[PDB]
Amino acid sequence: DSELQLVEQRIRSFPDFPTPGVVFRDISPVLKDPASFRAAIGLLARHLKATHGGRIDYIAGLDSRGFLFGPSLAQELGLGCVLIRKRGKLPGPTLWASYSLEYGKAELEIQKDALEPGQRVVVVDDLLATGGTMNAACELLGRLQAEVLECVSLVELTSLKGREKLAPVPFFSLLQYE
Amino acid sequence: DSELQLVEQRIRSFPDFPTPGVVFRDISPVLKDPASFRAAIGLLARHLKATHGGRIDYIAGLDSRGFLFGPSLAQELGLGCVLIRKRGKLPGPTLWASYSLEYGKAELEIQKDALEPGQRVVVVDDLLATGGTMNAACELLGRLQAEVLECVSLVELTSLKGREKLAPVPFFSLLQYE
Ligand SMILES: O=P(O)(O)OC[C@H]1O[C@H](OP(=O)(O)OP(=O)(O)O)[C@H](O)[C@@H]1O
Ligand SMILES: O=P(O)(O)OC[C@H]1O[C@H](OP(=O)(O)OP(=O)(O)O)[C@H](O)[C@@H]1O
Ligand SMILES: [Mg+2]
Ligand SMILES: [Mg+2]
């Protein structure tokens, strides 16, 4: 797919970042090349419409890199975007959920009125690694009695088995690296 | 202006967050209402085209809330978006710039290869308060020899004199509160 190639060729892979042996997949060049960004958003939107039809009510974008994609994806689908943030950032009543990040723990948070019970959401982030971040997002959304139809990302690091961590919630990525 | 009203009516104010006496202007409902989000992006894009014609090379979006607007604004203008991040997040050689956040210090960071000398940039963030964050972004861009044509936000807190802090760099906000 030439569209997918426009995204793939704009992923920059940095070895030994942040630690030796780990390859960092930098999406910055996708953002910097408007054709690449448009392609990525288009491919995600097409997948989501083909898979869910009119079922999606909202996109949820994950703080922080997921914010780069959530609003554009929502816009392309004619939907709003709700936010899931690192804890401490959002005003008003919230729920929060811990997850494991590198060597310690972190928490995500959502405003209690972000969604109503029964609303259907797709979560977007830039990259799925261990699945911890996305899993915390799904937990929060479930606690608002929202239905998570799918999680999606531009990049998936398949050797880390994030897909399995999210099951039974469906997952889709544009690009896969071991 | 009904377009501007679509944005204004989706700002939610929270007293005493995160500290007593201040009012947090929550842009979440702008993101959640696709018409509101489209209006905000459109108003910013129209202003920028009206003020700079075709001279803008890139949008720079600021981590984290600014990420919600940078790519969409860039896309509307047919431009790429470059990233300025909280320090520690970007791979490759970087520059960083400290600024005063609440009671302590934070740092923004940019990849050394993010822009070439002479390239023309408009910085976008959700909110201008003291101007510390935006000012740090301008410092980083200037240290890459980029030309900052303008900084823009959805919300400006005028009593904090952020505009003055940025001068002589032009600034534009959609909405103003004390
Ligand atoms: O699948 P996981 O193992 O949880 O890792 C994936 C997450 O890691 C990165 O975010 P990071 O926490 O580095 O924060 P950022 O958004 O501030 O870059 C990335 O943007 C994902 O959100
Ligand atoms: O003009 P200033 O006084 O610098 O304040 C404005 C900045 O403050 C907020 O960011 P915050 O640091 O709260 O981080 P966030 O983007 O993670 O919410 C806001 O999104 C601006 O970036
Ligand atoms: Mg992240
Ligand atoms: Mg910010």
Give strand pairing partners of B147: B120
Residue B126 CA: which ligand 2 atom is closest? Answer: 20
Give the span between the Cα atoms of A60 and A46, in whole angstroms.
17
- Phi-psi bin for B88: left (phi > 0), alpha (psi -120 to 50), beta? left
* Longest Cα–Cα distance in chain A: 45
Q: Do A56 and B34 touch, CB atoms closer than 8 A?
A: no
Give the span between the Cα atoms of B67 and A33, in whole angstroms.
16
Give the span between the Cα atoms of B145 and B110, in whole angstroms.
13
Does the Cβ of B84 fall within 6 Å of ligand 2? no
Which experimental method was this entry solved with? Answer: X-ray
Give the span between the Cα atoms of B110 and B133, in whole angstroms.
13
Q: How far are the Cα atoms of A98, A130, A135, A157, B29 from residue B66, in angstroms, in the given order?
A: 25, 26, 24, 27, 15
Nearest residue in chain A measured CA to CA from B24: A91
Q: Which protein residue's CA is at the shortest distance from atom 9 of ligand 2? A: B127
Taking contacts as CB-CB distances below 8 angstroms, the residues of chain B near A64 are: 63-64, 67, 86, 89
Give strand pairing partners of A121: A58, A148
Instruction: Name the token pair of B136.
Output: 């740090």
DSSP, residue by residue, B120-164: EEEEEEEEESSSHHHHHHHHHHHHTT-EEEEEEEEEEEGGG-HHH
**What phi and psi values does residue B43 have, to the nearest 5 degrees?**
-65, -45
Determine which helix (DSSP H) or strand (DSSP E) holds A30, and give its type and residue range. helix A28-32
Interface check for B119 against chain A (CB to CB < 8 A): the answer is no
Give the three-class secondary structure for A176. Answer: strand
Give the span between the Cα atoms of B5 and B36, in whole angstroms.
9
Q: Do A109 and A87 touch, CB atoms closer than 8 A?
A: yes
Q: Do A32 and B58 touch, CB atoms closer than 8 A?
A: yes
- 27-46 in chain A: CB under 8 A from chain B: 28, 31-34, 37-38
DSSP, residue by residue, A138-169: HHHHHHTT-EEEEEEEEEEEGGG-HHHHHTTS
Residue B168 CB contacts under 8 Å (≥ 6 apart), including other chains: none
Taking contacts as CB-CB distances below 8 angstroms, the residues of chain B near A24 are: 91
Cβ of B28 and A72 within 8 Å? no
A97-105 LR contacts (CB < 8 Å, sep 24+): A97/A136, A97/A139, A97/A140, A97/A143, A98/A136, A99/A132, A99/A133, A99/A135, A99/A136, A100/A130, A100/A132, A101/A132, A101/A133
Strands A80-86 and A58-62: parallel
Instruction: Name the token pair of B171.
Output: 């600034």
Q: Do B60 and B82 touch, CB atoms closer than 8 A?
A: yes
Give the span between the Cα atoms of B159 and B155, in whole angstroms.
12
- Phi-psi bin for B36: left (phi > 0), alpha (psi -120 to 50), beta? alpha
Strand runs labelled E in chain B = 12-15, 23-26, 58-62, 80-86, 94-101, 104-111, 120-128, 147-157, 171-177
Give the span between the Cα atoms of B28 and B36, in whole angstroms.
11
- Residue A7 half-sphere exposure toward CB, CA atoms < 13 A: 20
Q: Do A130 and A165 touch, CB atoms closer than 8 A?
A: yes
Q: At CA B118, angle to CA B117 and CA B121, rounded to 5?
A: 105
**What phi and psi values does residue B50 have, to the nearest 5 degrees?**
-70, -25
Strands B58-62 and B23-26: unpaired
Q: Do B36 and B10 touch, CB atoms closer than 8 A?
A: yes
**What phi and psi values does residue B118 have, to the nearest 5 degrees?**
95, -20
Q: Do A36 and A28 touch, CB atoms closer than 8 A?
A: no
Resolution (A): 1.5
Q: Do B124 and B69 touch, CB atoms closer than 8 A?
A: yes
Interface check for A65 against chain B (CB to CB < 8 A): the answer is yes
Give the span between the Cα atoms of B67 and A71, in whole angstroms.
9
**b/e per residue B76-106 (b: at least 16 CB within 10 A):** bbebbbbbbbbbeebbeebbbbebeeeeeee
Q: Which protein residue's CA is at the shortest distance from atom 19 of ligand 1? A: A127
| Three-class SS of A76-118 | HHCCEEEEEEECCCCCCCEEEEEEEECCEEEEEEEECCCCCCC
Q: Which domains does chain A have, with CATH numbers?
A: 1-178 (3.40.50.2020)
Give the span between the Cα atoms of B37 and B127, in whole angstroms.
15
Is A156 exposed, middle or buried (CB count within 10 Å of its CB: 0-12, 13-18, 19+)?
buried
**b/e per residue A166-177 (b: at least 16 CB within 10 A):** beebebbbbbee
